[PDB]
Design a protein around this ligand. Sequence first.
Ligand SMILES: *[C@](*)(=O)[C][C][C][C][C][C][C][C][C][C][C][C][C]
Ligand SMILES: *[C@](*)(=O)[C][C][C][C][C][C][C][C][C][C][C][C][C]
Ligand SMILES: *[C@](*)(=O)[C][C][C][C][C][C][C][C][C][C][C][C][C]
Ligand SMILES: *[C@](*)(=O)[C][C][C][C][C][C][C][C][C][C][C][C][C]
Ligand SMILES: *[C@](*)(=O)[C][C][C][C][C][C][C][C][C][C][C][C][C]
Ligand SMILES: CCCCCCCCCCCC(=O)O
Ligand SMILES: CCCCCCCCCCCC(=O)O
Ligand SMILES: CCCCCCCCCCCC(=O)O
Ligand SMILES: [Zn+2]
Lengths: 238, 238, 60, 252, 285, 285, 285, 29, 29, 29, 29, 29
Amino acid sequence: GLPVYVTPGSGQFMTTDDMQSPCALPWYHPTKEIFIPGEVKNLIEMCQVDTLIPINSTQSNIGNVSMYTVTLSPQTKLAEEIFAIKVDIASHPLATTLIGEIASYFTHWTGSLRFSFMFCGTANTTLKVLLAYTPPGIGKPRSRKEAMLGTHVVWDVGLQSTVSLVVPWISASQYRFTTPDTYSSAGYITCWYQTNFVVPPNTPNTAEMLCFVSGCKDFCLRMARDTDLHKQTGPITQ
Amino acid sequence: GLPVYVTPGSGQFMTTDDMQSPCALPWYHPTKEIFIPGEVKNLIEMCQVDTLIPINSTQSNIGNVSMYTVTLSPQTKLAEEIFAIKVDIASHPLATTLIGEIASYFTHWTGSLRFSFMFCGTANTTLKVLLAYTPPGIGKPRSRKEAMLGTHVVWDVGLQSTVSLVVPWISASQYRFTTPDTYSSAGYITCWYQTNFVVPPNTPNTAEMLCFVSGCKDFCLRMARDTDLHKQTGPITQ
Amino acid sequence: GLPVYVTPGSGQFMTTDDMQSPCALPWYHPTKEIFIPGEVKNLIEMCQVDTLIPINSTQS
Amino acid sequence: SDRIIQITRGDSTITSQDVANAVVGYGVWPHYLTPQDATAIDKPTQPDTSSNRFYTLDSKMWNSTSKGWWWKLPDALKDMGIFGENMFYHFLGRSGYTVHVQCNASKFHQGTLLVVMIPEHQLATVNKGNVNAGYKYTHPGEAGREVGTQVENEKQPSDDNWLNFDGTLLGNLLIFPHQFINLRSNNSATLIVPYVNAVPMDSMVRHNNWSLVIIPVCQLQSNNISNIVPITVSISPMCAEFSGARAKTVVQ
Amino acid sequence: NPVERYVDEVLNEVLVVPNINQSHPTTSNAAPVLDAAETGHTNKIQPEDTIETRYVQSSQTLDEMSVESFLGRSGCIHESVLDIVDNYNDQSFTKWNINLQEMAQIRRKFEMFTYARFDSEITMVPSVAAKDGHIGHIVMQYMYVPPGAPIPTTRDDYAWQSGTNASVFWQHGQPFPRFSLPFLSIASAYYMFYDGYDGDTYKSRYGTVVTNDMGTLCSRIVTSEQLHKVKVVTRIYHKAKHTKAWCPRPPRAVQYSHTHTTNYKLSSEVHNDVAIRPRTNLTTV
Amino acid sequence: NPVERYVDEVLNEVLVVPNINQSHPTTSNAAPVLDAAETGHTNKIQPEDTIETRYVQSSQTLDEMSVESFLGRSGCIHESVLDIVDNYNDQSFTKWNINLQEMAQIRRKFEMFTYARFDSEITMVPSVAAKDGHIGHIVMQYMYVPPGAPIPTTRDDYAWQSGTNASVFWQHGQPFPRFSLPFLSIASAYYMFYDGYDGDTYKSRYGTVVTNDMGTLCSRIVTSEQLHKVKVVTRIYHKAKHTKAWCPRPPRAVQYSHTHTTNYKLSSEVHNDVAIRPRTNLTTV
Amino acid sequence: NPVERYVDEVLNEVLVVPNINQSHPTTSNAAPVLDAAETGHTNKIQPEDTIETRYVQSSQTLDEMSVESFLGRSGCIHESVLDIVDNYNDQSFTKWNINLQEMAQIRRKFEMFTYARFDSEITMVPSVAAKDGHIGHIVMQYMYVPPGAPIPTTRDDYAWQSGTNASVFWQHGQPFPRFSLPFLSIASAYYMFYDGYDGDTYKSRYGTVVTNDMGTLCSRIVTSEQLHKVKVVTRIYHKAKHTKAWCPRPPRAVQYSHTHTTNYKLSSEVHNDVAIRPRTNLTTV
Amino acid sequence: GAQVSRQSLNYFNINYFKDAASSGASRLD
Amino acid sequence: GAQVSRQSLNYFNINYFKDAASSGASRLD
Amino acid sequence: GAQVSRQSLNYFNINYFKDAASSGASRLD
Amino acid sequence: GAQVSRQSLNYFNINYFKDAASSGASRLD
Amino acid sequence: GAQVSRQSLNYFNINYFKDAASSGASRLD
Ligand SMILES: *[C@](*)(=O)[C][C][C][C][C][C][C][C][C][C][C][C][C]
Ligand SMILES: *[C@](*)(=O)[C][C][C][C][C][C][C][C][C][C][C][C][C]
Ligand SMILES: *[C@](*)(=O)[C][C][C][C][C][C][C][C][C][C][C][C][C]
Ligand SMILES: *[C@](*)(=O)[C][C][C][C][C][C][C][C][C][C][C][C][C]
Ligand SMILES: *[C@](*)(=O)[C][C][C][C][C][C][C][C][C][C][C][C][C]
Ligand SMILES: CCCCCCCCCCCC(=O)O
Ligand SMILES: CCCCCCCCCCCC(=O)O
Ligand SMILES: CCCCCCCCCCCC(=O)O
Ligand SMILES: [Zn+2]
């Protein structure tokens, strides 16, 4: 017979191996494939779709649709802060968004993020807001002046209800860890009143805003891992 | 020697594997093959042949040739029901027919069924009968009117003794389970008097009818399995 | 199957062997290589550089 | 103008002067079944204009406390003219749909409805073990279901809008074909969905292919609350075809 | 082209079923639905002849229904037991007159044909039960003894020398033994049924016992007597390869009772002896 | 060229992400940052549209994010236990109605799609615990019983003959058993979700239990009763191969409670039921 | 020519050292022996410049001195111990934060460079010590848990399902497990040294701990509790493949004390802390 | 024993033993 | 079953079993 | 994966797995 | 050691060892 | 490493490892 040398690794079962194996049902012909709309070939397709950020997920709002809305109203003090969150793709409150969930199945991420905001007040309600991205190496801005020294978009509410702020990939390393890591923390996104929320008389004095997130053309995930956003604490029975 | 990697599965014995093995009798020359009439190359050849359905298999008829005949006679009420059975290839009373037995060696089936009926009364006995197939999603028809809204054949008894009713493949899925499964139940076949059984004087007032079943050009079985229509409850000895 | 003869040495682990082995992370694409000054390809490069001899290494 | 739309189906024409474009589910326009994908062998019946027309369902009232509404297809149209008749007389059916949700208010009102079309929306029950949603509850017909009104029963489906009535988060419903009716911008939503299933045709009586879910994500608010603001849904089957004719199935 | 044919093998699309063609309404004096079963032929009517069908492209294949596939699955045909109780010399070896009649599962499949010709793949699964705790080093010998060759009468019989007979030695821990056997009959095919005798007297034998003698399989634990007793059960699995079959027949409807014979037993309630489930009446589905 | 394509496979550079192009200041009446989410579409704005970017050559690939990669990892789907306590005949065999619903890890991944079609690779990891000290010679039999085939009711049931069913025999000490299974559905794809019933009455079953019946896996210790008792746990691992998936959906946000159903349980403090960590307020990062 | 190059590989003659040429007496105002070390350069004087040499053909090669060769030898980086003493559930599994800093032998070699990039070959050598006599059937599971993935807290934790993580199952008696790992850094090369922090405060971490997080290796005895206790020690060996290294540095002169840091300890008699052997005086060889 | 086809998609139908009984399952037709 | 390419850098995409389900992970696209 | 050279002295530089990390020690230069 | 014939039905009569005594059963004639 | 000769009687003198010390007994002369 042909002389062979059994190499280390032989006989082991590695869950990620890619070997061939005999078919238990020889001659079996599987059912004809039919056309079904909506085929997905790569998870990136799901990362490019906007999903809502549960940005107002305070303990009292969780379990309510209100955990998805930010309330705006006429201010008495100028340049007030509206909200502030970390840009880290798998940090809270970004974690449960579709992109955050998919990112949690990977160890590394890279690319730019697209954050969108839709104003839901009346057609007669006006507002100008400043959305800013603060690159790392500094704390979150304490004021609008501090925040606007960074990347930002001044949003004027009008006929078109939605605006998009892109958080560019500004990192030392080509990739960052999806899991919270000091070295790879991506920074912050803050929102401030640029002017003010203004309404005519007989119009509601508060309005909501919805927040979305998705990945830009260069978003990419790497090193598959099991998610920490879901668990099994017991047997799943019939 | 050539470095090799022993893969998972090595050393196992799978009853359906397809490997080569050394011959215990080297140099042995088998007996010359002669021509023998009746060679069978595929089980489909056996599924295309009509066999009798033990349609009248009531407890008292089992063990008698009468379990294969349906009796017809002059009716006093119009549109009476003659018989009703499920179309499921491996359900009773279709189970013990040749096609039902072969189907029981497989897990899935598809295609149209051909049901034939041969009238065995005198040459002077006349009759018109309505044979109907009721697709699933509804109960078995309670009347002739209900039954004829489905697929059907009006059989006129005459010179040619036999008629055939084809149960077309009308299913959501491409295949159905041979074993009784709610989701894959194929429907029913009922027989009703269209007119009446009529005879001249001095002629027997009842007559028999034989029922056959076979598969059409598109009948097909899949996923070989052991049959549940035969068992072994003890050792088979010499 | 192809008749084979398992040779002596099979199954052993020699720290200096040179075999191939399955990758635990299939499909993974490593980080792009960038230019970094000072690449060393052979230890001889380090042996050709002068270093000081602690010639007066008396205990004191 | 890009704000206007006219949709003609059979003998019905619907208009809106404030639209937000239209969504074609998964980018596939509805079409009849081809011989390559077909399995049932009988010739299908295609009612055409008598079935592929707009059917308007019962209107609902949207108020400050509304939690949402949902309808299942083809169930919602089981009683709609020729389409309804065909789905009961035949074992198999197949159809696409044009869904047009309507809701007008004023330039002094605010509110936002998330309109989603979900394929295979298998509903869950909450804290009831392995007891699943009863047939009756997932087949409400044209009345649909008003979330947070139904007095609980064992077979009563989940009414948790934030968990999509199935154990997944509301914010992620956007992965399904959807639109928003944001009162400041539009007064209607239009979604055209193709037939989606793992089989070419199916029983329209026991399998609901699509579920129309409407959740007010931004509360309806105005300074003229006495004026009722309804939500009206009009659905038009597209390329409806049926197979396996027999007597009419009577449910219950 | 052997490569196109190859692809068909991998995909299992060697034997395709025909399509259903679109049909139309008809009014004719040709009635395909009418025929005469008396002729002994099956009416070849198809769905297009009785209803208005649509055109459907078939993608089903009959590959799995081939005789090679049907009989080409390895099934158990014998369970050999070597139970060391109190006498190693007597209990460490045994013999079995080879046949495919003792296990109903494979017997019934082969018996759906009158004659069959095939090569055989035999795989053995030995399992050593440690009755006292340890198994030691178990080495087994399986010798194929053709009719006429001397059958060993003791565990040290000279016949075990296997100077000519084929013997397979298996060592515990090593993979399951397996070998192939060419078509062994002196005839052109094996008789699954035989309406004949080995003579013409009242005491002549009837049936396949007359024609189907395949010899004896003699087994022995090669290892000498050990302190701890073991029970070695060797299950023999058989698979038919390169199969041809002739003259199909009705499947066995009742339980088998003996080898090489169609004999059966019937109870007072025959419905319990067959798979037929009694119907309430003709109209109860 | 299949060789250039080959190199891309080895390097994992089949799907490359686009580069970032250099952009400049703009003053225009075209405002790409403004749009209308009401349309149901995602604004396709890129970094070059909102800031002045530099040119950067991308070297990232999406190969690992493919559906084949995502679902192509072997995960545990079942842990079969054969614990010999006091009755070998009753405790030496078992059965399991096959499904991918009992282990949350792989179930959640497959459920991110509505329909999926794939071949399956099954690898088994048996571990024999010597409860009394010795294990003897353990030989296992794993039989795949398709719906309808007879299920063994005893360790010596005739069904174990496996005359037609596929059985895998494993011998302790030999490598882990493994085999592939073709796409088994009667439909064109497996239903991950099914908003349907098996009938139209109040007692009709709802969900995937109606459509996803894959049969039963029957296991048995082939070795006869041994002096020393053992506990054999066989873990079944499943990997999807040649995968296609349709209609993506939101990931399971709460714990699973039962197989074939989306049912869940909620506590009085719902924030404990989801992965969402409560924020102190809107401005606390 | 790849075949000539091939022969050089087999003979290990890819990198040849130059010959020594014959030289002659000289009287010149060019003095190659004189130079200025202040420049930071090494005087490139050769033997032919200082003495009268003969011609000698060199046959020495530098192949073995290549970085691939130097770092391409498998060395132990960790010794994992699973000692079953009195609680199987608690003592049958463990975890290790992966690093190449715990064993001085390979650590010192890699640290002769500032940055290094390579793929890794991991070979594991498990040895089962029978503390009570028998070992039974030992099956091990080694799961690679990337940073962020859930770490198992019990031997039956759902994380062991390995639905996505790579797990290697080894069965006692089978050859030593082995697998390769691609270059895992988020950077272009691994930092052997890092003069940086993960922040700018007094409590910020310093060194390679900030940049070199490779996850955790979680091990577990898959086999359920057995009567006899065992002590399983798994030694992990690492070999660098396809290596590149940058910026060479002085070798570690004192003993290592901790991972990820250059910290060291000095005694009162420093000559005992370094390999320098004290000289009696300048003229005592 | 090797039946080498070409189409490139080369097929190798190898017969490892010298007796016909030794080969695997037969082709069809 | 062998898909032999040439470029020399020859590629051998061998399929050891006769059923499609038996082959390893699929290529992409 | 096979780099076949010819000189006859044919060289077969086979790569048994589909990931670059899997190959043995690198050539030099 | 390989006697390669062609007919395509290629025959490979491989001799794995370097001594004649090592080869299997002889051909006939 | 393969020295392929032809005469057809093809000879394959394969060297499985990359070091000369690894090869078997030397030819003569
Ligand atoms: C056929 O009758 C002989 C079977 C020979 C078995 C060995 C097959 C492997 C051949 C490898 C040769 C490589 C060609 C260079
Ligand atoms: C493909 O369908 C058949 C797979 C055959 C498996 C054997 C592969 C090794 C071939 C070696 C031949 C050497 C050529 C001379
Ligand atoms: C390379 O990418 C594929 C590696 C294939 C491994 C199999 C190598 C043996 C090939 C034998 C073929 C014989 C030619 C006839
Ligand atoms: C004969 O004297 C030498 C025997 C060599 C044994 C190795 C046989 C396998 C050859 C595979 C080569 C594939 C060709 C590309
Ligand atoms: C020589 O330096 C490389 C040795 C490669 C060892 C593998 C030998 C088997 C080659 C089979 C190839 C089949 C050709 C198609
Ligand atoms: C030695 C193992 C058993 C070999 C069996 C092959 C012989 C098949 C002949 C079948 C004839 C019969 O059983 O009546
Ligand atoms: C016999 C080992 C298990 C084989 C599993 C393959 C079947 C996959 C079908 C998944 C359907 C479901 O779980 O709902
Ligand atoms: C899972 C087995 C161990 C894998 C080790 C490969 C990682 C090498 C990175 C070295 C970084 C360091 O130790 O500082
Ligand atoms: Zn012992």
